[PDB]
Amino acid sequence: MNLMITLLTNFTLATLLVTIAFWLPQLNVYSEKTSPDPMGSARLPFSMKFFLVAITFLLFDLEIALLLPLPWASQTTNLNTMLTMALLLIFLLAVSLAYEWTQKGLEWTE
Amino acid sequence: VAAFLKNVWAKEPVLVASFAIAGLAVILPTLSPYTKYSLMINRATPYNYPVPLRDDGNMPDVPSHPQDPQGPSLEWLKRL
Amino acid sequence: PGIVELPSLEDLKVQEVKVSSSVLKAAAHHYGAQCDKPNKEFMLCRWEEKDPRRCLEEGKLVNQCALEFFRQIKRHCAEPFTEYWTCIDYSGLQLFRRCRKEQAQFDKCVLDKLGWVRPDLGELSKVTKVKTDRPLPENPYHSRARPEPNPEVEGDLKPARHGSRLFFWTM
Amino acid sequence: PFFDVQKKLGVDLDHWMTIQSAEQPHRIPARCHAFEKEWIECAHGIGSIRAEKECKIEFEDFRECLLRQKTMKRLNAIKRQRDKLIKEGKYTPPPHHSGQEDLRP
Amino acid sequence: MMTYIVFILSIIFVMGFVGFSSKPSPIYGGLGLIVSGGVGCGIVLNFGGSFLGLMVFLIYLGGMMVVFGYTTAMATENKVVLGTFITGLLMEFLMVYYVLKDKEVEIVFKFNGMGDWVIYDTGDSGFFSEEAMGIAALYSYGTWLVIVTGWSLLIGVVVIMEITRGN
Amino acid sequence: MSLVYMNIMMAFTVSLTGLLMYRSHLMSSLLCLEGMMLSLFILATLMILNSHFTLASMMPIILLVFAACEAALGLSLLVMVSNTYGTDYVQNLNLLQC
Amino acid sequence: MNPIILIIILMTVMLGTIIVMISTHWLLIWIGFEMNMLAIIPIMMKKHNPRATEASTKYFLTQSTASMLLMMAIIINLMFSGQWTVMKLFNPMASMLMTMALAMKLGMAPFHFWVPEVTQGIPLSSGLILLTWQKLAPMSVLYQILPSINLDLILTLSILSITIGGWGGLNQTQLRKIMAYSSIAHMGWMTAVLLYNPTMTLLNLIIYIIMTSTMFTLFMANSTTTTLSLSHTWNKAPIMTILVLITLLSMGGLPPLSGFMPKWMIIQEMTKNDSIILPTLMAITALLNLYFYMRLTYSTALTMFPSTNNMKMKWQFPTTKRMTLLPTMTVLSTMLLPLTPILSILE
Amino acid sequence: MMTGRQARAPLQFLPDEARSLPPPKLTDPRLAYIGFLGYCSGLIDNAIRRRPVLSAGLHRQFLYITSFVFVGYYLLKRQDYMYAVRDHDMFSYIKSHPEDFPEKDKKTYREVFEEFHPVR
Numbered sequence A: 001m002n003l004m005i006t007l008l009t010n011f012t013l014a015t016l017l018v019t020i021a022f023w024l025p026q027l028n029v030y031s032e033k034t035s036p037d038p039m040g041s042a043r044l045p046f047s048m049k050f051f052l053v054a055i056t057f058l059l060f061d062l063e064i065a066l067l068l069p070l071p072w073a074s075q076t077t078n079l080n081t082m083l084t085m086a087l088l089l090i091f092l093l094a095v096s097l098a099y100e101w102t103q104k105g106l107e108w109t110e
Numbered sequence B: 001v002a003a004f005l006k007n008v009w010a011k012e013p014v015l016v017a018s019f020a021i022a023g024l025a026v027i028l029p030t031l032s033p034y035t036k037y038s039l040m041i042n043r044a045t046p047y048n049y050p051v052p053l054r055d056d057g058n059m060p061d062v063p064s065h066p067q068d069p070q071g072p073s074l075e076w077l078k079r080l
Numbered sequence C: 001p002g003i004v005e006l007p008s009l010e011d012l013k014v015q016e017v018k019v020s021s022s023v024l025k026a027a028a029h030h031y032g033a034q035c036d037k038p039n040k041e042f043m044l045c046r047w048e049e050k051d052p053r054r055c056l057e058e059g060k061l062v063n064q065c066a067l068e069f070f071r072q073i074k075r076h077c078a079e080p081f082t083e084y085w086t087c088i089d090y091s092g093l094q095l096f097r098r099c100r101k102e103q104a105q106f107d108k109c110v111l112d113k114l115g116w117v118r119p120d121l122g123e124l125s126k127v128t129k130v131k132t133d134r135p136l137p138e139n140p141y142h143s144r145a146r147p148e149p150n151p152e153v154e155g156d157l158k159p160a161r162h163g164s165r166l167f168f169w170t171m
Numbered sequence D: 001p002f003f004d005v006q007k008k009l010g011v012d013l014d015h016w017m018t019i020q021s022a023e024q025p026h027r028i029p030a031r032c033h034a035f036e037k038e039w040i041e042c043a044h045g046i047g048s049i050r051a052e053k054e055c056k057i058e059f060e061d062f063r064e065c066l067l068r069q070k071t072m073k074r075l076n077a078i079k080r081q082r083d084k085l086i087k088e089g090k091y092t093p094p095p096h097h098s099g100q101e102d103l104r105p
Numbered sequence E: 001m002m003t004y005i006v007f008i009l010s011i012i013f014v015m016g017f018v019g020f021s022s023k024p025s026p027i028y029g030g031l032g033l034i035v036s037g038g039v040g041c042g043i044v045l046n047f048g049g050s051f052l053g054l055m056v057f058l059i060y061l062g063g064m065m066v067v068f069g070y071t072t073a074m075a076t077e078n079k080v081v082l083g084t085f086i087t088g089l090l091m092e093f094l095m096v097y098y099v100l101k102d103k104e105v106e107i108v109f110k111f112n113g114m115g116d117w118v119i120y121d122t123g124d125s126g127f128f129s130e131e132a133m134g135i136a137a138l139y140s141y142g143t144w145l146v147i148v149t150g151w152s153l154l155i156g157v158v159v160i161m162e163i164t165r166g167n
Numbered sequence F: 001m002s003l004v005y006m007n008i009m010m011a012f013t014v015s016l017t018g019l020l021m022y023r024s025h026l027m028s029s030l031l032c033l034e035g036m037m038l039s040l041f042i043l044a045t046l047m048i049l050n051s052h053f054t055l056a057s058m059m060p061i062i063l064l065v066f067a068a069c070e071a072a073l074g075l076s077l078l079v080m081v082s083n084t085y086g087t088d089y090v091q092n093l094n095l096l097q098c
Numbered sequence G: 001m002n003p004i005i006l007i008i009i010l011m012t013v014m015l016g017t018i019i020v021m022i023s024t025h026w027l028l029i030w031i032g033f034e035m036n037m038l039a040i041i042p043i044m045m046k047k048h049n050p051r052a053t054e055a056s057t058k059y060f061l062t063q064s065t066a067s068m069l070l071m072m073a074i075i076i077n078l079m080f081s082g083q084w085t086v087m088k089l090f091n092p093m094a095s096m097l098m099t100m101a102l103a104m105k106l107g108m109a110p111f112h113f114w115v116p117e118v119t120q121g122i123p124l125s126s127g128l129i130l131l132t133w134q135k136l137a138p139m140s141v142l143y144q145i146l147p148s149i150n151l152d153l154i155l156t157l158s159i160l161s162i163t164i165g166g167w168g169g170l171n172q173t174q175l176r177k178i179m180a181y182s183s184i185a186h187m188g189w190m191t192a193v194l195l196y197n198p199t200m201t202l203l204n205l206i207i208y209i210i211m212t213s214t215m216f217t218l219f220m221a222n223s224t225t226t227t228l229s230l231s232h233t234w235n236k237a238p239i240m241t242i243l244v245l246i247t248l249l250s251m252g253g254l255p256p257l258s259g260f261m262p263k264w265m266i267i268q269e270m271t272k273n274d275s276i277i278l279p280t281l282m283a284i285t286a287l288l289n290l291y292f293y294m295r296l297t298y299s300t301a302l303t304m305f306p307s308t309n310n311m312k313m314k315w316q317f318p319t320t321k322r323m324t325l326l327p328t329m330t331v332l333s334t335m336l337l338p339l340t341p342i343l344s345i346l347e
Numbered sequence H: 001m002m003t004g005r006q007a008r009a010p011l012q013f014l015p016d017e018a019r020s021l022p023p024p025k026l027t028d029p030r031l032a033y034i035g036f037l038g039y040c041s042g043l044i045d046n047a048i049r050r051r052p053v054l055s056a057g058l059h060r061q062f063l064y065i066t067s068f069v070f071v072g073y074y075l076l077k078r079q080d081y082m083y084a085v086r087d088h089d090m091f092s093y094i095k096s097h098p099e100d101f102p103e104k105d106k107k108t109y110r111e112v113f114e115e116f117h118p119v120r
């Protein structure tokens, strides 16, 4: 409840400052500008490597999501099984990284 | 066995430290004597209520009071 | 179905332990030491009957024995206990570890004037046995009669009479 | 086909998350643990055909524990009659249901 | 009005989906799905699923919709849209008017019209969130689940590197 | 039953009808699919938290992880379409009518 | 594709089907379908051409929509039953959604509109995998939920699949689309007898998998994807025209071939249950697919064809293609009817 | 149908009680037909690879016939077992429910009146 008050206050202060920033110099009548970039009008070429690093982020972020309950999982009574599955998950993250390595997926953004 | 190891320690010391720390993390809980006490402390931590037993007449190993000398103890944890 | 039976408001009147949670937490180890038997008779009745309406009187004994626990503090060691639960009461997590000298004064005065030994690490979490006179509930779930199981297979396995009997296949 | 490898090899792959009445961490009961236990112990071994007709009362008690449709229906009826008598003026709330009595424990 | 806050968020959640299933563009479709993920996350957080709410924020919004907006940026440079939007909004507000004037509704299932604060439990859980310990049980009780999920993610890495190669 | 469940299912059916018959960008179809996944996450979470069924608390994370991996797979297909036509317009996917 | 990676991916396809077959928890059913889809997507993109990318995208969208409907069905089952056992469902809405979702995974009508396209866009071995191995897991889930399956829905889907698979293959010259409409028709034949006797459903599944495996293996052995290239087979290998003859006669249901075995038994299990009109018009529609099979082998397999001169080069080389299990599968897809009471091993 | 029967001991191709049933002889006509399917498989295998059909790979045709007879023997054992289980369940169900299968009184044709339809 106080959390929603805080979030709403931060959004309100940000919207206040952004509106004042967009509209305090719009009181000025400075001049009207016509103003008739590295690329001129060429279409943005698709970069395959940027997409590959975004999907590699997404899959390793999912493996992170599996890793996230480990401080609570260390409190279990089945510690041998828990330690085995934790080492197996971090090892599978390392194997996904090794396959991403050796198949040249981490190249030109290495 | 030491030429390849010195070669990878001269070329890729990041990966040598990585595989060495990973190998220690895998094999060392099977060699540590304190790994038993982790299990022992995580089962000694009373998250729930110790639900009492109806005294049937013959349970000598169950105490009648918390301060009775029989039952599980935590002197191994108070000493360590 | 039926009408759920509830006890009257006179059946629920008992003198409440009207003290704060830091007061309860300060004396909690000596409470679990000295008020063992009625508390465990109540919690045995409470896990066995699975019904709080059948656990009122034992609960009253809890509220009878807790108050006599605090009166026996108030007659003897009111000031070290007050100095102790005030220090417990300051902390937002109510740490025992921030309050060890006030604990030592309270434990000293309690062991001197009442002879009570504080429980050690691992004692109040023991599973203890409880000798009551109330009978064991023969059906605590009020379960009705279970359906009879299907008849099992018996008899020695004979061959199929003239095979598959599938249209003309004689085996 | 249901090739029951888990029972043939005697391994517990996914029987543990299957029902609410199973062994939970730290002995946490579900809200309808008793109802689901009663319905499972009714319907065990008798087959689904006999279970749909011979364990109807346990299953209705368990489904009504899960969804609480009858309980919310009764609360709707009581709150609606109470709102009608407040609008008519034939009823007044007591001090323990208006918040003026400094609760018990 | 504060008692129905989960319900109020749910209405916005429905509105949010009609915000983007009308589909003016994958840009604004992504924006509507991000706002929808935030308000449905607020729904989850208001029942005590704090870890699952932070999994909505960290993994769904912070992990995956980032990749959708990224691919929308790099790969993808009215009447039907606004009509489907206002159609779904009129349907949802007529549903809200029905369920608030009746406190009972049937579209497919029978639904109560009081707030869902009634259907909770009156107990406590001691020194733990039950949802936290149930997610901690993934490593102790969920062995086969961890095995199949890790193998699916490893295969997912391999499969992405296969089909993105083009050779 | 619960009233928030009706809204979550109605959200699911809205995104299901948004997936089915529009013939638009492929990314908009993937957005409708992940809105379906979002509503499944919310609905599974509210049920499992409602019933206090502790072992299924790890269930929606599973429902997240697999499906997000699924989402990654879909984007790669889109990118291959985005490497073939220059657009993700699904009416370019009509080579296999004949 | 690296052969090690190909082995790993095919084992993951098999592993997903096994997880659907053996698991008792609905989440693991859903996980097995997710694993199966995620693993089969590179098998379709083996040759890396835009038709395979279109086919894989359409397959992804259909199986993903089906998987979301499956999880919604599981979730409504959790509402109305509070549990997760893979058994009968406890709500007719979950029953309808799971029947719809499994019909989308099989490719049954009215969700058939991807099966002729996707099978056309992918190679013959991946189309073999799609039309044989990808039928095993949803038929297993339909096998386990049949106490909850609505009869009118499953029979509507079944006869709609049989009619659309019958009247869709009359127009077809592509062999992969003929196999795909044959797939849709046979899944209608499997699911119409499901609530009457599921052993005959399994019998139809196994006989269909044998005949489909025979047909795709002959297609890979001859490298023919069209009717007209199939007509050029007698001048290269005359026995292959004989084998596609007898196997296409078997898939339509001629006696005394083995593909007459299931559907006859299916009619035999539908008149016991006093349904006379339904297997009658069902086999009336099967006569139409048998009839275009008889045009597609009379007009364009038996009577010998104009060839090309470059074929006389191909006379000097034998087939080095690994025709794995092809004589065994050809014998089993034709000559198995005298062993018709073998079906009891599937009980 | 019988899936609740082989669910108490699942994944058994031949159970223990299947050993109380007479196994098929090696001169079973079903098993001889399966061996003929093996011989046909060997001939089709020599036909598709342009070998002499009746001549090449006599060891290979011998392994085709051997392998089909070997698989078909156990398939016929399971077949006979499942029809034996079907009849066992049938008879034990009729014995455990006498009310559902009444011994209907056998009337001879001296009491049975059938309508005569003349062909004229």
Ligand SMILES: CCCCCCCCCCCCCCCCCC(=O)OC[C@H](COP(=O)([O-])OC[C@H](O)COP(=O)([O-])OC[C@H](COC(=O)CCCCCCCCCCCCCCCCC)OC(=O)CCCCCCCCCCCCCCCCC)OC(=O)CCCCCCCCCCCCCCCCC
Pocket (backbone or CB within 6 Å): C168, C169, C170, C171, G256, G337, G338, G339, H025, H027, H028, H029, H030, H032, H033, H036
């Ligand atoms: C002391 C210990 C040791 C003692 C040793 C004693 C024995 C020493 C000799 C060893 C050899 C034994 C041979 C097997 C036993 C006798 C089998 C027999 O005659 O069954 C009669 C069987 C029924 O007669 P039965 O009077 O009721 O039984 C007399 C016996 O007690 C028969 O026994 P059952 O009453 O128990 O019969 C059981 C039942 C009797 O059957 C039934 O209850 C009715 C169901 C039969 C199946 C109907 C399917 C119809 C639709 C498919 C038609 C396919 C196209 C036709 C064939 C085209 C070419 C493949 O069988 C079945 O249902 C199984 C299916 C039929 C298998 C027959 C054996 C085949 C082996 C050779 C295969 C070669 C092709 C044969 C013809 C294939 C078509 C059947 O006859 C038929 O079904 C008609 C087919 C002809 C019989 C096969 C004769 C085997 C030898 C053939 C040599 C010539 C081969 C020429 C080259 C290949 C052809 C191009």
Ligand SMILES: CCCCCCCCCCCCCCCCCC(=O)OC[C@H](COP(=O)(O)OCCN)OC(=O)CCCCCCCCCCCCCCCCC
Pocket (backbone or CB within 6 Å): A091, A094, A095, A097, A098, A101, A102, B008, B012, B015, B016, B017, B018, B019, B020, B022, B023, B026
């Ligand atoms: C068993 C223990 C646990 C193992 C699993 C957990 C691992 C944790 C770390 C995860 C790492 C993930 C990614 C690993 C990829 C490994 C392969 C690799 O990198 O090979 C390529 C590399 C040559 O580099 P290049 O290809 O040119 O790359 C650009 C940089 N120049 O070639 C190399 O770098 C050579 C790499 C092999 C030699 C490393 C030897 C290290 C030895 C340390 C002491 C012993 C440790 C015990 C375990 C044995 C490890 C071999």
Ligand SMILES: CCCCCCCCCCCCCCCCCC(=O)OC[C@H](COP(=O)(O)OCCN)OC(=O)CCCCCCCCCCCCCCCCC
Pocket (backbone or CB within 6 Å): D001, G010, G125, G126, G128, G129, G132, G133, G136, G205, G206, G209, G210, G213, G217, G220, G322, G323, G324, G325, G329
């Ligand atoms: C109750 C159910 C329980 C389970 C029951 C069992 C179900 C069995 C279902 C079988 C499905 C088989 C699918 C195909 C095989 C899988 C692997 C595969 O695709 O192998 C083909 C392989 C591909 O090699 P590649 O190099 O890619 O080929 C391209 C050509 N240059 O190589 C080739 O292309 C070579 C050409 C020949 C391939 C023939 C493969 C035949 C496989 C099917 C055998 C018959 C089915 C088994 C028996 C009946 C079981 C129901």
Ligand SMILES: C=C(C)[C@H]1Cc2c(ccc3c2O[C@H]2COc4cc(OC)c(OC)cc4[C@@H]2C3=O)O1
Pocket (backbone or CB within 6 Å): G291, G294, G295, G298
């Ligand atoms: C073109 C296709 C798809 C089919 C139809 C067809 C053939 C080949 C041959 C013939 C045929 O039409 C039939 C029509 O009626 C009978 C009826 C017969 O018996 C009932 C009979 O017996 C041999 C023969 C015939 C025709 C016949 O020779 O291929």
